[PDB]
Design a protein around this ligand. Structure first.
Ligand SMILES: CCCCCCCCCCCCCCCCCCCC(=O)O[C@H](COC(=O)CCCCCCCCCCCCCC)COP(=O)(O)OCCN
Ligand SMILES: CCCCCCCC/C=C/CCCCCCCC(=O)OC[C@@H](O)CO
Ligand SMILES: CCCCCCCC/C=C\CCCCCCCC(=O)OC[C@@H](O)CO
Ligand code: NA
Ligand code: NA
Ligand code: NI
Length: 310
């Protein structure tokens, strides 16, 4: 029972998130109790990621490091640069540009693992690239964010590294330990992971939307269009990054999805933690978490149909 509702909730995530977002846009007091808990809500999500990691998920890293490295490089070369170029070309306000760049600087999101499966790409590659990007993000996300956004607002890069360590790295390590400890019984914790992760992230979105209602009223449509462009250009450059390195079609699909899909929950949590007096900074991350599941689903559905799915 717990499993099949998890799949339905997974397929309908953007609808649930959109309704919670609407509820927060008309009743901000609704989810403002969750604001202070955003880092912990993300911590739970990343704790779930650690519970599902296994040593065989890194077999491809030691057998085929170059393809994995290509994916990780494409992640941190395309999405931060794309966020900066969009911010400059569209002349976005500093607050919004910082939040868009912040999203672009985060690692990939584990949802890319599922979209890659649905798209019939290389799932082992998707899992490896997301895992590696995530584990090195405490160093790379602040470093790139500092370089691209440091002239817009004051950035405490070392402080953000420690935030990622506490919200990402330690929960993952706790998840790895708990799993090595529990062994096979861990399946009974991960049976709850999809619904818990969905509840946590919609709470983050609702808290972010409520705190920035006024800014969404004046800039909500602009931010949405930037997210669509940022996510979409990611797919495009990820695809051709794979094609021009000579990788096969299944890997092209994987890195398309890997690059365009982001750990946008982390971007929202970092903005809440470090830019709390500017709530709109977290809005790009919140919207990205919704849109990239819609866009990734459309892309995966398209590629599955091309691969012969009835
Ligand atoms: C900016 C928007 C970019 C979105 C798509 C970029 C990723 C697709 C790259 C690509 O070349 O795939 C083609 C398939 O068409 C498609 O991918 C069409 C479906 C795109 C779905 C829309 C996703 C974002 C909205 C090639 O076709 P091929 O994969 O057979 O080689
Ligand atoms: C369902 C399984 C339950 C297992 C629980 C494991 C979760 C462990 C996660 C820990 C992550 C905590 C790191 C969170 C610590 C950083 C929070 C912070 O300092 O920012 C200030 C905020 O209050 C601003 O809003
Ligand atoms: C701390 C930060 C670490 C980032 C480095 C990327 C992490 C990659 C290490 C994963 C690993 O090798 O463990 C599984 C193996 O046993 C596979 O057989
Ligand atoms: Na992935
Ligand atoms: Na990505
Ligand atoms: Ni048929």
């Amino acid at each position: 029972i717990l499993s099949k509702i998890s799949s339905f909730i997974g397929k309908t995530f953007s609808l649930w998130a959109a309704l919670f977002a609407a509820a927060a846009f008309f009743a901000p007091d609704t989810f403002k109790w969750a604001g202070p808990y955003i880092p912990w809500l993300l911590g739970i999500i990343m704790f779930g990621m650690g519970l599902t990691l296994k040593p065989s998920d890194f077999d491809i890293l030691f057998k085929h490091p170059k393809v994995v490295i290509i994916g990780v490089i494409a992640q941190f070369a395309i999405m931060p640069a794309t966020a900066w170029l969009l911010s400059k070309l569209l002349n976005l306000p500093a607050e919004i540009a910082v939040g868009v760049i912040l999203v672009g600087c985060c690692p990939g999101g584990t949802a890319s693992n599922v979209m890659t499966y649905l798209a019939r790409g290389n799932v082992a590659l998707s899992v490896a690239v997301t895992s590696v990007s995530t584990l090195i993000s405490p160093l790379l996300t602040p470093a790139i964010f500092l370089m691209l956004a440091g002239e817009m607002l004051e950035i405490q890069a070392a402080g953000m590294l420690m935030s990622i360590v506490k919200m990402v790295l330690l929960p993952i390590v706790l998840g790895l330990i708990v799993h090595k400890v529990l062994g096979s019984k861990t399946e009974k914790l991960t049976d709850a992971l999809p619904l818990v992760s969905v509840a946590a992230i919609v709470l983050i979105i609702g808290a972010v939307v409520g705190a920035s209602k006024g800014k969404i009223m004046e800039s909500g449509l602009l931010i949405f269009a930037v997210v669509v462009l940022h996510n979409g250009i990611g797919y495009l450059l990820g695809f051709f990054a794979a094609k021009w390195t000579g990788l096969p079609y299944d890997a092209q699909k994987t890195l398309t999805i890997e690059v365009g899909m982001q750990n946008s929950g982390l971007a929202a949590a970092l903005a809440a933690a470090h830019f709390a007096a500017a709530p709109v900074v977290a809005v790009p991350g919140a919207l990205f978490s919704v849109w990239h599941n819609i866009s990734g689903s459309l892309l995966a559905t398209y590629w599955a149909a091309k691969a012969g799915k009835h």
